[PDB]
Design a binder for this molecule. Structure first.
Ligand SMILES: COc1cc(O)c(C(=O)/C=C/c2ccc(O)cc2)cc1CC=C(C)C
Length: 121
C-alpha cells in the first residue's frame, strides 16, 4: 500500500515520497505519458509498468509486510498480490537509491505538457 512504499522510499533515500517522488518528471506520481526525463523518472515508469502486470491487485491500498536483513529489503509471505506488489515497490526504492546522485530539482513539479513522445512497457 502507499504507506509501506512511502516508508520504504524514506528508509532508502532519506527523502520523503511526498513531495520528492509525488510530482517528479513524467512518471513519478499521478499517471504518466511521454519520455521519462531522467534515471529517477525511469524508475517510476518501470514501477508503473510493474503495477501494470498485476491487473487484479490493488497496490495503493493492499498492505504487505517486509523486514530488513542487514540492509536488505525482504518481502514477507502474504497473498500472491501482496508478495508481487512488495517486489515492485522494492525495486523502485532501490532504483531510487541507485540514482540519488542525479536526482534533479529541475524536475520536481514538472508540467504535464512537457511530457511528450511515446513509450511502451
Ligand atoms: C499516511 O499517508 C497518506 C499518504 C498519501 O500518499 C495520501 C494521498 O492522499 C494521495 C497521494 C499520492 C497520490 C498519488 C501519487 O501518485 C502519489 C501520491 C494520504 C494519507 C494519510 C491521510 C490521513 C488523512 C490519515
Amino acid at each position: 500500500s502507499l504507506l509501506e512504499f512511502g516508508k520504504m522510499i524514506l528508509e532508502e533515500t532519506g527523502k520523503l515520497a511526498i513531495p520528492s517522488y509525488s510530482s517528479y518528471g513524467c512518471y513519478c506520481g499521478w499517471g504518466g505519458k511521454g519520455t521519462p526525463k531522467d534515471a529517477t523518472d525511469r524508475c517510476c515508469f518501470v514501477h508503473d509498468c510493474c503495477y501494470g502486470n498485476l491487473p487484479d491487485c490493488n497496490p495503493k491500498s493492499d498492505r504487505y509486510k517486509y523486514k530488513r536483513v542487514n540492509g536488505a529489503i525482504v518481502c514477507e509471505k502474504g497473498t500472491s498480490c501482496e508478495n508481487r506488489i512488495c517486489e515492485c515497490d522494492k525495486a523502485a526504492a532501490i532504483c531510487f537509491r541507485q540514482n540519488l546522485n542525479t536526482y534533479s530539482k529541475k524536475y520536481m513539479l514538472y508540467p504535464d505538457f512537457l511530457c511528450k513522445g511515446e513509450l511502451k512497457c
